[PDB]
Swiss-Prot record:
Catalyzes the NADPH-dependent reduction of a wide variety of carbonyl-containing compounds to their corresponding alcohols. Displays enzymatic activity towards endogenous metabolites such as aromatic and aliphatic aldehydes, ketones, monosacharides, bile acids and xenobiotics substrates. Key enzyme in the polyol pathway, catalyzes reduction of glucose to sorbitol during hyperglycemia. Reduces steroids and their derivatives and prostaglandins. Displays low enzymatic activity toward all-trans-retinal, 9-cis-retinal, and 13-cis-retinal. One of its GO terms (cellular component) is mitochondrion. The modification Phosphoserine is found at residue 3. It comes from Homo sapiens. This is Aldo-keto reductase family 1 member B1. CDD domains: AKR_AKR1B1-19. The gene is AKR1B1.
Amino acid sequence: MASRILLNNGAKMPILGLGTWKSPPGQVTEAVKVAIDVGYRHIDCAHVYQNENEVGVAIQEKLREQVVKREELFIVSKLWCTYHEKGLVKGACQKTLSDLKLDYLDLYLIHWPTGFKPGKEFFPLDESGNVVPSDTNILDTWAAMEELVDEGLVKAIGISNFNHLQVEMILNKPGLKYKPAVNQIECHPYLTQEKLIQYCQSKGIVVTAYSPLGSPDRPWAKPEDPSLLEDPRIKAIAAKHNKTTAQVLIRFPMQRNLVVIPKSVTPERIAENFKVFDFELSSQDMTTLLSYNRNWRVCALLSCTSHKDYPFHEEF
Ligand SMILES: NC(=O)c1ccc[n+]([C@@H]2O[C@H](COP(=O)([O-])OP(=O)(O)OC[C@H]3O[C@@H](n4cnc5c(N)ncnc54)[C@H](OP(=O)(O)O)[C@@H]3O)[C@@H](O)[C@H]2O)c1
Ligand SMILES: C[S-](O)c1cccc(CNC(=O)c2ccc(F)cc2OCC(=O)O)c1
């Protein structure tokens, strides 16, 4: 299938990218170098991942080596929750640009709808363990994101972990200048997201699926949690197609017109995960994978369940 999807800003976005959350700083430079060498053109980043400098080393080296031109890359980062204030957005973007060695981002996302008190700590807590919110309304954060487009720092802006009412709040913003190009959300066979995906696609917003393999390295994993990569039903579909379970899990969102961002620091897996443009899941396979939904979330933002903008109380 086609390698890129057209965004509502007129630019094309590669449907397969490399994730970088949890990629160790001493391994992510080589991971991104390998990824670019084996065909990846989209890297998903974030300031909160604390490894953008090392990602940037890889990008810059492959640009210097002329393995790829800047216009061929699609680099995404995200505004962390402690920078939702109007006066902090530009500097947060600029710090990400400096770390990544870039003079623009292809896409910059509001990482979560929840703003937190600014400061050094990424999760400021009160003495009782609750996250300390910011009063900055997300519409005002959106206006600050729009300024970045108009200053040439980013080509597109979008959102992440927004529920459908929060997307709708942006779309209904008075004086809205740029619609969100993307909503990046958790999506896999155990959290299939039919309702939110349909809503976003109907508005021309492209959906990126994160944790497509179920994030087996997530720090809060428990032994009793479900495991996509070990699910015998998914292994059976993979075996039938002579592919790995990971390859099925990556191809699944692609066939839903989603972008997908599997993470790996393992060279062989980085290459394997990209080899998903040479086979097709049947409609029956797709419906079967969808049937595994259990509304199970890797990323529930649990310290934030009383924040006014916590996204996961709503059904979708
Ligand atoms: N917007 C958000 O709030 C948000 C939240 C979560 C994730 N994300 C983004 O989405 C990306 C992907 O999600 P994720 O990191 O949570 O998890 P994931 O991509 O679902 O899974 C990554 C895990 O799978 C392993 N793996 C990768 N390819 C494999 C293969 N072929 N066979 C077996 N195991 C394989 C990796 O191991 P190795 O690395 O050791 O090879 C790692 O432990 C993130 O890195 C981040 O960029 C965004
Ligand atoms: C549901 S509450 O809304 C929320 C809020 C906020 C957040 C949440 C979840 N996360 C975490 O934890 C985190 C941290 C750190 C890092 F580095 C990373 C991570 O993860 C991945 C992404 O991307 O995020 C939740």
